[PDB]
Design an enzyme around this catalytic site. Structure first.
Site, PDB file in Angstrom:
ATOM      1  N   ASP A   1      -8.924  -1.971  -7.456  1.00  0.00           N
ATOM      2  CA  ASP A   1      -8.310  -2.378  -6.201  1.00  0.00           C
ATOM      3  C   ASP A   1      -7.989  -3.853  -6.132  1.00  0.00           C
ATOM      4  O   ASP A   1      -7.018  -4.214  -5.508  1.00  0.00           O
ATOM      5  CB  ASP A   1      -9.243  -2.076  -5.036  1.00  0.00           C
ATOM      6  CG  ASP A   1      -8.540  -1.427  -3.846  1.00  0.00           C
ATOM      7  OD1 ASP A   1      -7.337  -1.205  -3.908  1.00  0.00           O
ATOM      8  OD2 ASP A   1      -9.202  -1.233  -2.826  1.00  0.00           O
TER       9      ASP A   1
ATOM     10  N   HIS B   1      -6.993   7.007  -2.804  1.00  0.00           N
ATOM     11  CA  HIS B   1      -7.885   6.045  -2.120  1.00  0.00           C
ATOM     12  C   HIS B   1      -7.299   5.255  -0.960  1.00  0.00           C
ATOM     13  O   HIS B   1      -8.060   4.609  -0.196  1.00  0.00           O
ATOM     14  CB  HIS B   1      -8.543   5.062  -3.158  1.00  0.00           C
ATOM     15  CG  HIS B   1      -7.716   3.832  -3.447  1.00  0.00           C
ATOM     16  ND1 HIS B   1      -6.778   3.832  -4.438  1.00  0.00           N
ATOM     17  CD2 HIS B   1      -7.678   2.594  -2.880  1.00  0.00           C
ATOM     18  CE1 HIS B   1      -6.172   2.655  -4.465  1.00  0.00           C
ATOM     19  NE2 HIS B   1      -6.679   1.896  -3.515  1.00  0.00           N
ATOM     20  N   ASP B   2      -5.987   5.364  -0.783  1.00  0.00           N
ATOM     21  CA  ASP B   2      -5.285   4.698   0.304  1.00  0.00           C
ATOM     22  C   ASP B   2      -4.210   5.631   0.861  1.00  0.00           C
ATOM     23  O   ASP B   2      -3.100   5.195   1.166  1.00  0.00           O
ATOM     24  CB  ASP B   2      -4.654   3.393  -0.182  1.00  0.00           C
ATOM     25  CG  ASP B   2      -5.662   2.267  -0.299  1.00  0.00           C
ATOM     26  OD1 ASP B   2      -6.536   2.154   0.586  1.00  0.00           O
ATOM     27  OD2 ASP B   2      -5.581   1.495  -1.277  1.00  0.00           O
TER      28      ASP B   2
ATOM     29  N   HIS C   1       0.974   1.093  -5.829  1.00  0.00           N
ATOM     30  CA  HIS C   1      -0.378   0.507  -5.797  1.00  0.00           C
ATOM     31  C   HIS C   1      -1.368   1.505  -6.368  1.00  0.00           C
ATOM     32  O   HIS C   1      -2.119   1.153  -7.263  1.00  0.00           O
ATOM     33  CB  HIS C   1      -0.780   0.100  -4.364  1.00  0.00           C
ATOM     34  CG  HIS C   1      -2.246  -0.196  -4.208  1.00  0.00           C
ATOM     35  ND1 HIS C   1      -2.865  -1.276  -4.806  1.00  0.00           N
ATOM     36  CD2 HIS C   1      -3.204   0.447  -3.507  1.00  0.00           C
ATOM     37  CE1 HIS C   1      -4.141  -1.267  -4.492  1.00  0.00           C
ATOM     38  NE2 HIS C   1      -4.387  -0.212  -3.741  1.00  0.00           N
TER      39      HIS C   1
ATOM     40  N   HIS D   1       0.772  -1.229   0.000  1.00  0.00           N
ATOM     41  CA  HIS D   1       0.000   0.000   0.000  1.00  0.00           C
ATOM     42  C   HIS D   1       0.790   1.257   0.000  1.00  0.00           C
ATOM     43  O   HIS D   1       0.649   2.081   0.837  1.00  0.00           O
ATOM     44  CB  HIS D   1      -0.974   0.025   1.143  1.00  0.00           C
ATOM     45  CG  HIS D   1      -2.057  -0.973   1.013  1.00  0.00           C
ATOM     46  ND1 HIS D   1      -2.087  -2.124   1.742  1.00  0.00           N
ATOM     47  CD2 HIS D   1      -3.145  -0.997   0.227  1.00  0.00           C
ATOM     48  CE1 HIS D   1      -3.162  -2.808   1.426  1.00  0.00           C
ATOM     49  NE2 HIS D   1      -3.818  -2.147   0.504  1.00  0.00           N
TER      50      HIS D   1
HETATM   51  C1  LIG Z   1      -2.075  -9.879  -4.992  1.00  0.00           C
HETATM   52  O1  LIG Z   1      -2.989 -10.593  -4.148  1.00  0.00           O
HETATM   53  C2  LIG Z   1      -3.747  -9.828  -3.301  1.00  0.00           C
HETATM   54  C3  LIG Z   1      -3.905  -8.446  -3.393  1.00  0.00           C
HETATM   55  C4  LIG Z   1      -4.694  -7.755  -2.489  1.00  0.00           C
HETATM   56  C5  LIG Z   1      -5.328  -8.424  -1.457  1.00  0.00           C
HETATM   57  C6  LIG Z   1      -6.192  -7.716  -0.469  1.00  0.00           C
HETATM   58  N1  LIG Z   1      -6.744  -8.468   0.417  1.00  0.00           N
HETATM   59  N2  LIG Z   1      -7.614  -7.949   1.300  1.00  0.00           N
HETATM   60  C7  LIG Z   1      -8.441  -8.986   1.973  1.00  0.00           C
HETATM   61  C8  LIG Z   1      -9.591  -9.334   1.051  1.00  0.00           C
HETATM   62  C9  LIG Z   1     -10.464 -10.361   1.678  1.00  0.00           C
HETATM   63  N3  LIG Z   1      -9.705 -11.584   1.992  1.00  0.00           N
HETATM   64  C10 LIG Z   1     -10.161 -12.826   1.575  1.00  0.00           C
HETATM   65  N4  LIG Z   1     -11.501 -13.072   1.569  1.00  0.00           N
HETATM   66  C11 LIG Z   1     -11.980 -14.270   1.132  1.00  0.00           C
HETATM   67  N5  LIG Z   1     -13.322 -14.479   1.143  1.00  0.00           N
HETATM   68  N6  LIG Z   1     -11.197 -15.270   0.680  1.00  0.00           N
HETATM   69  C12 LIG Z   1      -9.881 -15.020   0.690  1.00  0.00           C
HETATM   70  S1  LIG Z   1      -8.715 -16.164   0.187  1.00  0.00           S
HETATM   71  C13 LIG Z   1      -7.435 -15.075   0.592  1.00  0.00           C
HETATM   72  C14 LIG Z   1      -7.873 -13.868   0.987  1.00  0.00           C
HETATM   73  C15 LIG Z   1      -9.308 -13.842   1.133  1.00  0.00           C
HETATM   74  C16 LIG Z   1      -8.547 -11.356   2.874  1.00  0.00           C
HETATM   75  C17 LIG Z   1      -7.656 -10.242   2.359  1.00  0.00           C
HETATM   76  C18 LIG Z   1      -7.773  -6.615   1.504  1.00  0.00           C
HETATM   77  O2  LIG Z   1      -8.750  -6.209   2.115  1.00  0.00           O
HETATM   78  C19 LIG Z   1      -6.722  -5.712   0.886  1.00  0.00           C
HETATM   79  C20 LIG Z   1      -7.055  -4.215   0.887  1.00  0.00           C
HETATM   80  C21 LIG Z   1      -7.965  -3.810  -0.230  1.00  0.00           C
HETATM   81  C22 LIG Z   1      -8.179  -4.532  -1.316  1.00  0.00           C
HETATM   82  C23 LIG Z   1      -7.538  -5.857  -1.563  1.00  0.00           C
HETATM   83  C24 LIG Z   1      -6.421  -6.210  -0.554  1.00  0.00           C
HETATM   84  C25 LIG Z   1      -5.171  -9.810  -1.344  1.00  0.00           C
HETATM   85  C26 LIG Z   1      -4.375 -10.522  -2.245  1.00  0.00           C
HETATM   86  O3  LIG Z   1      -4.138 -11.876  -2.216  1.00  0.00           O
HETATM   87  C27 LIG Z   1      -4.536 -12.636  -1.074  1.00  0.00           C
HETATM   88 MG   LIG Z   2      -7.810   0.599   0.897  1.00  0.00          MG
HETATM   89 ZN   LIG Z   3      -6.062   0.087  -2.497  1.00  0.00          ZN
END
Ligand SMILES: COc1ccc(C2=NN(C3CCN(c4nc(N)nc5sccc45)CC3)C(=O)[C@@H]3CC=CC[C@H]23)cc1OC
Ligand SMILES: [Mg+2]
Ligand SMILES: [Zn+2]
Length: 333
Positions: free
Chosen positions: A237, A124-125, A88, A84
């Site tokens: 995002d 946004h971040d 990004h 972040h």
């Molecule tokens: C490159 O790969 C990635 C990039 C960004 C992220 C993010 N992750 N999360 C969360 C989302 C909900 N999550 C999950 N929910 C569900 N239902 N299943 C699963 S399986 C594994 C996770 C997961 C946990 C992490 C955030 O909020 C970040 C802030 C804003 C936007 C996206 C950002 C994550 C990445 O790869 C994991």
């Molecule tokens: Mg954010």
């Molecule tokens: Zn973001």
């Protein structure tokens, strides 16, 4: 906020960006960072070039110098964290541009709305610290308390909005100063609504609302427009998985290291640590990417593309191809 000195400005202007097409879906921001010794200068330049190219600050009375100042004020507000950070948000900006203009999502919105999205990507971040909303609420940090006593569990997003309003409140960085009346109001309000919709706790509800609106021919038009904006910033995002595998992999590494660092801190303070943040488990990248794909990103892109964003079909195809590649990594392990 101190003013943006002219050398700061001029430094960004000197970057040339040869061998790069910033409007392409395969644009590679990692390569751009490595191609010079001032990556924070090149990143700024990509944004500047994207915005001027769209033809949009021109139409809404925003001059080039205000545009640059705004970007640079945003940049100084990004910390040195693994994911972040400023790259990004420049990535989200450039990605949104491709959705609007390669994916034809521009047809669903006004020119002002398109302008607002590109700007909103950059704010946004703002001031993100590598720690998620959960951290602040677990450790009862000031921001957490403040959010909680104010009535809003979207701890960081309200923070980013507060800072975006503070940057735009300085006229030398007000990219919306050339707007008036309803237009000005709409830019602020849509910008804010978009950043508040990036809280992933609200992911399911924002998706369901957009889908519901897109399916309804008698949806309130203004409302459909807002939700489309919200969904497009959301899309940017979570767009790392829609990119060429090697790019996608690089993003995955960065977000993984950021998660791990938070976990390290959580252990220090004694609070609960989830497995996803635990460096002492060492899950594979592949499995973590496959799970994110299957549970979050494939259904999201598939659904919005089928609902009404037909031009973004490439996102679904690339997600499918990226998933298979990750499966192949595991299959030959
Ligand atoms: C490159 O790969 C990635 C990039 C960004 C992220 C993010 N992750 N999360 C969360 C989302 C909900 N999550 C999950 N929910 C569900 N239902 N299943 C699963 S399986 C594994 C996770 C997961 C946990 C992490 C955030 O909020 C970040 C802030 C804003 C936007 C996206 C950002 C994550 C990445 O790869 C994991
Ligand atoms: Mg954010
Ligand atoms: Zn973001």
């Amino acid at each position: 906020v101190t003013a943006i000195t002219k050398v700061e400005r001029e430094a960004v202007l000197v970057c040339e960006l040869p061998s790069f097409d910033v409007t392409d879906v395969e644009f590679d921001l990692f390569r751009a960072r490595e191609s010079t010794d001032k990556p924070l200068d090149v990143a700024a330049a990509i944004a500047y070039r994207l915005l001027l190219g769209s033809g949009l600050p021109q139409k809404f009375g925003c001059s080039d110098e205000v545009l640059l100042n705004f970007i640079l004020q945003c940049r100084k507000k990004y910390r040195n964290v693994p994911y972040h950070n400023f790259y990004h948000v420049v990535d989200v900006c450039q990605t949104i541009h491709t959705f609007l203009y390669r994916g034809n999502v521009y047809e669903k919105l006004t020119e002002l709305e398109c302008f607002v999205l590109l700007i909103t990507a950059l704010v946004h971040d703002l001031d993100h610290m590598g720690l998620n909303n959960s951290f602040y609420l677990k450790t009862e940090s000031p921001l957490g308390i403040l959010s909680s006593a104010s009535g809003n569990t979207s701890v960081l997003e309200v923070h980013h909005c507060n800072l975006a309003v503070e940057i735009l409140s300085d006229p030398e960085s007000d990219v919306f100063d050339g707007l008036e009346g309803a237009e000005r109001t709409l830019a602020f309000r849509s910008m804010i609504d978009c950043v508040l919709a990036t809280d992933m706790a609200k992911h399911g509800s924002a998706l369901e609302a957009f889908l519901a609106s897109a399916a309804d021919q008698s949806s309130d038009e203004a409302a459909f427009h807002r939700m489309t904006m919200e969904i497009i910033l959301k899309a940017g995002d979570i767009s790392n998985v829609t990119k060429p595998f090697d790019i996608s992999r690089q993003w995955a590494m960065a977000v993984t290291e950021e998660f791990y660092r938070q976990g390290d801190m959580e252990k220090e303070r004694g609070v609960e640590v989830l497995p996803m943040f635990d460096r002492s488990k060492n899950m594979e990248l592949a499995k973590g990417q496959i799970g994110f794909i299957d549970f979050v990103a494939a259904p999201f892109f598939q659904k919005i593309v089928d609902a009404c964003l037909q031009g973004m079909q490439w996102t679904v195809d690339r997600i499918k191809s990226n998933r298979a590649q990750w499966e192949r990594v595991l299959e030959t392990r």
